[PDB]
Design a protein around this ligand. Structure first.
Ligand SMILES: C[C@@H](O)c1nc2cnc3[nH]ccc3c2n1[C@H]1CC[C@H](C#N)CC1
Length: 292
């Protein structure tokens, strides 16, 4: 059941790319009459030994996850006559939360943003039970299932913690989403549940900006750093800024109690950041206490 035949998998559309993988919208059509289910298919651009090993790990990670706020694993396709590997996931028609919020920003009130926030936290609590570190939380990686439900939608950088170890050092050669990174990820390449909490704070920030371009984390940090800065100078200044309490500003219209949650996530002291369980409870208590 979790093995899809390449001959029945038909390309429809490109969905997106990230890291060293691409995701496409495909019809799985065993009846060969254009009526079959639509699925999302992830492929690697280069099946090097390293990239393929990492992809197999990603597949095992997603397969192991079963939660209402995590995109569903469907299977694998051993394509090119079983000399290639593709990952099959459910396809969510509403797309990413990033694009959804940018489109429906009038429809979506604060209570709804908090509902999405809560759901992201719950998916992350679940990841923590498996000792998985996501390492790439951002609204681009969250999918909308319906107007009332989101799912964490990509796990391309997700790592399993070594047993009883609180962090994983990933000396990555190449680009990184530095404007979502915790300071210790920038300075020591250390990723942990606590660095996911930092990045979650940035996701919460993203939501309350409604993805206004001039308010993005890169736009705001570069404004503080100096828009003229290039290369490593950007990283030097970002690190120095963060170490001495430089932070993203409170978004226009954002309740101060919600900004306080972001600022608590953005603690330089790793062991003082709240847990995802703390965060889900706090966010749901706020929602439950609100005027409506
Ligand atoms: C268009 C893009 O936001 C998108 N729409 C999707 C619908 N269903 C999906 N099922 C799995 C991914 C996925 C989808 N993705 C993105 C999510 C992020 C991913 C990465 N990296 C690229 C595809």
């Amino acid at each position: 059941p979790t093995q899809f035949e390449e001959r029945h998998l038909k390309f429809l559309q490109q969905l997106g790319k990230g890291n060293f993988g691409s995701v496409e919208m495909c019809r799985y059509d065993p009846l060969q009459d254009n009526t079959g289910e639509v699925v999302a298919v992830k492929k690697l651009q280069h099946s090097t030994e390293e990239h393929l090993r990492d992809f197999e790990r990603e597949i095992e990670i997603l397969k192991s996850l079963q939660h209402d706020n995590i995109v569903k694993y469907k299977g694998v396709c051993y394509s090119a006559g079983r000399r290639n590997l593709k990952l099959i996931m459910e396809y969510l028609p509403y797309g990413s939360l990033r694009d959804y919020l940018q489109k429906h920003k009038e429809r979506i009130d604060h209570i709804k943003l908090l509902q999405y926030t809560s759901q992201i936290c719950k998916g992350m609590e679940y990841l923590g039970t498996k000792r998985y570190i996501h390492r790439d939380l951002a609204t681009r990686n969250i999918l909308v299932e319906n107007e009332n439900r989101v799912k964490i939608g990509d796990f391309g950088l997700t790592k399993v913690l070594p047993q009883d170890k609180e962090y994983y050092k990933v000396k990555e050669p190449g680009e990184s989403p530095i404007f979502w990174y915790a300071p210790e990820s920038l300075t020591e390449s250390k990723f942990s549940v606590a660095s996911d909490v930092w990045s979650f704070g940035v996701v919460l920030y993203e939501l309350f900006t409604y993805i206004e371009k001039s308010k993005s984390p890169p736009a705001e940090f570069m404004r503080m750093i100096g828009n003229d800065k290039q290369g490593q100078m950007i990283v030097f200044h970002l690190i120095e800024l963060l170490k001495n309490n430089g932070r993203l500003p409170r978004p226009d219209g954002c309740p101060d109690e919600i900004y306080m949650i972001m600022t608590e996530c953005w603690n330089n002291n790793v062991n003082q950041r709240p847990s995802f369980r703390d965060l889900a409870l706090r966010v749901d208590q706020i929602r439950d206490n609100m005027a409506g």
